[PDB]
Structure 1
Amino acid sequence: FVETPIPDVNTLALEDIDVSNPFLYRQGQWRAYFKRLRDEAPVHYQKNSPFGPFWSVTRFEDILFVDKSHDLFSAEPQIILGDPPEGLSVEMFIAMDPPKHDVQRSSVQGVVAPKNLKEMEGLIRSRTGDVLDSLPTDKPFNWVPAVSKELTGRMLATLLDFPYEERHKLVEWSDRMAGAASATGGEFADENAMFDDAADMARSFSRLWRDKEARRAAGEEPGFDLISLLQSNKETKDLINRPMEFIGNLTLLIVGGNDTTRNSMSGGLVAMNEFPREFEKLKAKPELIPNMVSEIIRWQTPLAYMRRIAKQDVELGGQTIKKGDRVVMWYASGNRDERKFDNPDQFIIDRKDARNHMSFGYGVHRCMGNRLAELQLRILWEEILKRFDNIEVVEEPERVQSNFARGYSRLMVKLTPNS
């Protein structure tokens, strides 16, 4: 993939609108392209793309139907638009249908048990406050590494009890995975690097499993982390011996929580910068933080879509999706659908229906980590409000190349503390 200027959507025949282009978000053309699809081709077939042909489903109501109807639309074998590079396919329950999906999700869902998240609030808030206190207030800095990636990486390490000093690896491996050119149009096109990483990652999870079992056998009390949970349950105490399940489950937790958390933490600042009256509203009414977090997640939509395959011919939106066709559920478009949300492109932190967004999906795959993400975002903004009278974005944000992740690689921020 090489970036070129994306033309006005009005220059295109409807059949030539290709929303798999991974520069549509960066260039700001995604809003007009998806509005044209919602209005005039809400169930749209693209015959020609670098990823092969695919349907786009772009209205909120129709996306709900596809996401909930796993008897008609399969999540197998992959949920990104393209294909993983050869040798890198791993089975993850995000790309599995019931009943097996339900079985595999049950084996890990305890890691985000509400009682466990509540016990970790002090740690999350301490990390958040320490990170914010460390930021300079006399010069701008890049928020993406300093805050969003920093906090996400610590959280991911805690979730796995992954060696804290190596947490940068959970994220580097994960980035090169979720950013495969063949899968998402991301910038990673070297299969040699992905082979090195996927193997390093698999070896690292195996060493962690053995270190944790040796520590448990030696009398270490079990913790909140996923490995401890897997080793405490009869069904999964032997998960090492099922390598596809073991590697797939652990990889899904890390990839699932990595750039989603990161880009939600960054995106709230970008939304405030575009709608600065909302920050004055927030400072005057801090009890809006929980609803604001929903509005940040709606407006940002950190994952633009999830993909499905039609299990049979399905009539949708005056169109016949054929058995075997790839069907892309464009959450990024659904969350801007004016049939669902009034003034959808506005960031409105007291929007009463913000919580009804589809950024987590709907149906059996609805995000397992939704409460953990919301918790971290709430604490982030609580701790921001204690410290800063103003936040300024000093340069146009740099947006990531991807058709899947909607995110930022550079967000240059100047802080003004209160007195």
Structure 2
Amino acid sequence: PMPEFVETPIPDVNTLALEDIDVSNPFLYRQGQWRAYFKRLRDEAPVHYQKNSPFGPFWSVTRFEDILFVDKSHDLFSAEPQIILGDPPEGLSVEMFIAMDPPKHDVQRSSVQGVVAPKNLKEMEGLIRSRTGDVLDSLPTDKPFNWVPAVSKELTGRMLATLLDFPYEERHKLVEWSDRMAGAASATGGEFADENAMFDDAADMARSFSRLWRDKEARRAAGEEPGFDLISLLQSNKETKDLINRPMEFIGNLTLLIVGGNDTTRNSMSGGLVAMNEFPREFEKLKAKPELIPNMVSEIIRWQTPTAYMRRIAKQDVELGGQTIKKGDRVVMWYASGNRDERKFDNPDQFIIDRKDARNHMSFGYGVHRCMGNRLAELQLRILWEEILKRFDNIEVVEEPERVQSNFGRGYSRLMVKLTPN
């Protein structure tokens, strides 16, 4: 059983020899050391091998251009068998096409991609906007409140339910299951170290998803209008009508969807407020020119980088950054560093809503695995800020945010916000 990660003070990077820089530490983000640690790696060892880590030996690729190459080169770097830095609880490795190489990756992704196709998103836009306005209206305006459960987690759970047509009153289950899987100490240095609960969740999820498939099939056989959820789409296409007969594909694809959209959406929604707090001239610029919302959504996603990395394994020896990556080595593409690389972005650490190249961010990765839900993610953020401008003249963070323990998700568990209506 992987032991629990206990927080200790992270020293300055200059106190360390290059070979001893270990960025797998899941408290780097919380302690505000990630920026300096990744800068030193970009400047002095952009392709860096760490031989001593709790998750095992690994390479760190930290420059924007080098990450691009690795992410795009599925001929040289495999996404199998996992894309988190460590390993899952033995027996609890779920099959997900995010950790699959072409050509199977392509078959499975194509079988679900229609759920976030633009025509499908347009039909979801009104429900997303309704819920966003209802949630914002319900918020207190005379006192600070925790934005994380009140807004980010609330809207994300509703969205995950809509994607699977999951019972709304059980939506919390999708988040709880996703949080435990992504926060496994063995995989991300997260706080979830009870493996029995992970096995319990796996069975509860297989049963819940199986019940959902059979329930939707029955309702379909009864002539219910086919919805815009993944289940309805899967049951509407010849190749996936029998998907329940293949349980690895079924449970894997559905688990990937909810984990993929769980804390990414949550921390995108919270992170924009943190960026507004650090660069409040950005809020005045936005109020003066709302047209900049779409570009600002890209800049929020660049600055926050809700998912810090994706991991690969070298299919062969590969020369990169003056180093020889050996076949079988684990290679970690640090999006969180790539997006702060001044070789691509001027003033990278600065939140600039009118940033000309904000759309060039690598927060969704690049290559065959580039985030499938990227348009829905941008849609949710665009609606949130449209509805924020309608209601509030100012939003202030009145307390230092509390940040989540993980080397994988970059996020906030507590964000105290004071709203000023207009």
Same fold per TM (> 0.5)?
yes
- Where do 4+ consecutive residues of structure 1 move more than 4 Å? none
Where in structure 1 are there 5+ consecutive unaligned residues?
Answer: none
Give the secondary structure class of the aligned counterpart of 2:234: helix
Residue 16 of structure 2: aligned partner: 12
1:410 aligns with 2:420: no
2: CA distance between counterparts of 1:199 and 1:9? 43
Q: CA offset at residue 74 of structure 1?
A: 0.3
CA distance in 1, matches of 2:207, 2:399: 41
In the TM superposition, what is the alpha-carbon distance from 1:374 to its structure 2 partner?
0.2
Which whole-Å CA distance do the structure 1 matches of 2:362 and 2:137 have between them? 34
Cα deviation for residue 116 of structure 1 reads: 1.1
**What's the offset of the Cα at 1:138?**
1.1
Encode CA deviations 1:158-179: one digit per residue, 9 max, x unaligned: 0000000000000011101100
Kindly provide the CA deviation profile for residues 267-295 of structure 1, in whole angstroms up to 9, marking residues without a partner as x.
00000000110001111111110000000
Q: Distance in 1 between matches of 2:221 and 2:80?
A: 38
For residues 162-201 of structure 1, the C-alpha deviation after alignment (integer angstroms, 9 at most, x for no partner) is: 0000000000111011000000000001111111111111
- What's the CA shift for 1:121? 1.1
Note the C-alpha offset of 1:221. Answer: 1.5
Q: State the partner residue of 1:347.
A: 351
TM normalised by structure 1 equals 0.99
Q: Alignment partner of 2:202: what SS?
A: helix
Shift of 1:229: 0.5
CA displacement 1:276-315 (0-9 Å, x = unmatched): 1000111111111000000000000000000000000000
| Alpha-carbon displacement from aligned partner over 1:342-371 (angstroms, at most 9, x marks no partner) | 000000000000010000000000000000
SS in 1 for 2:227: coil
C-alpha separation in 1, matches of 2:343 and 2:177: 39
What is the CA RMSD across the aligned residues, in angstroms? 0.5
Q: Secondary structure at the match of 1:78?
A: coil
Question: Equivalent residue of 1:120, what SS?
Answer: helix
- 1:202, CA displacement in angstroms? 1.3
> Which whole-Å deviations, capped at 9, do the CAs of 1:82-109 have from their partners, x for residues lacking one?
0001121011000011111000000000
Identity of aligned residues (%): 100
Using the TM superposition, give the Cα deviation of residue 392 of structure 1 relative to its aligned residue in structure 2, in angstroms.
1.1
SS in structure 2 opposite 1:235?
helix
Residues 113-159 of structure 1 deviation map (CA, whole Å, 9 limit, x = unaligned): 10111121111111100000000111111100110011111111000
How far apart are 1:394 and its partner, in Å? Answer: 1.2
Q: Distance in 1 between matches of 2:91 and 2:263?
A: 23
Structure-1 residue corresponding to 2:129 = 125
Q: Which moved more, 1:149-158 or 1:190-199?
A: 190-199
Q: What does 1:164-183 align with in structure 2 at a 5 Å threshold?
A: 164-183=168-187
Q: Which moved more, 1:102-111 or 1:117-126?
A: 117-126
Distance 1:93 1:325 in 2: 21
User: How many pairs does the alignment contain?
Assistant: 418
Aligned to 1:80, which of 68, 84, 98? 84
**SS of the residue 2:261 aligns to:** helix
* Cα distance, 1:412 vs structure 2: 0.6
Instruction: Output the CA distance in 2 between the equivalents of 1:193 and 1:98.
Output: 32
Q: Give how far 1:396 is off.
A: 0.4
| Residue in 2 that maps onto 1:330 | 334
Please tell me whether residue 36 in structure 1 is matched to residue 40 in structure 2: yes
* Cα deviation, residue 217, structure 1: 1.0
Q: Does 1:89 align with 2:86?
A: no
Within 2, Cα distance between the matches of 1:377 and 1:81?
A: 28
Q: Can you list the C-alpha shifts for 1:48-93, whole angstroms capped at 9, x where unaligned?
A: 0000000000000000000000000000000000000112101100
Name the SS of the counterpart of 1:153 in structure 2.
Answer: helix
State the shift of 1:218 in Å. Answer: 1.2
Deviation at 1:265, TM superposition (A): 0.3
Aligned to 1:289: 293
User: CA offsets, 1:24-65, max 9 Å, x none?
Assistant: 000000000000000000000000000000000000000000
Show CA shifts across 1:230-280 (max 9, x none): 111110101001001000000000000000000000000000000110001
**Residue deviations 1:303-334 (CA, integer Å, cap 9, x gap):** 00000000000000000000000000000000
Q: Distance in 1 between matches of 2:54 and 2:177?
A: 24
Q: Distance in 1 between matches of 2:88 and 2:37?
A: 26
Matched position secondary structure for 1:124: helix
Q: Secondary structure, in 3 states, of the residue corresponding to 1:27?
A: coil
Q: Secondary structure at the match of 1:401?
A: coil
- Give the distance between the partners of 1:203 and 1:315, measured in 2 at CA: 46
Query: Structure 2-normalised TM-score?
Result: 0.99
Moved more, 31-40 or 390-399: 390-399
Distance 1:202 1:260 in 2: 23
1:136 aligns with 2:140: yes
Supply the distance in 1 between the matched residues of 2:207 and 2:195 (Cα, whole angstroms).
Answer: 18
Give me the whole-angstrom Cα distance separating, in 1, the residues matched to 2:124 and 2:161: 13
Structure 2 residue corresponding to 1:372, chosen from 370, 376, 381: 376
Q: Secondary structure at the match of 1:308?
A: strand
Secondary structure of residue in 2 paired with 1:55: strand
Aligned to 2:6: 2
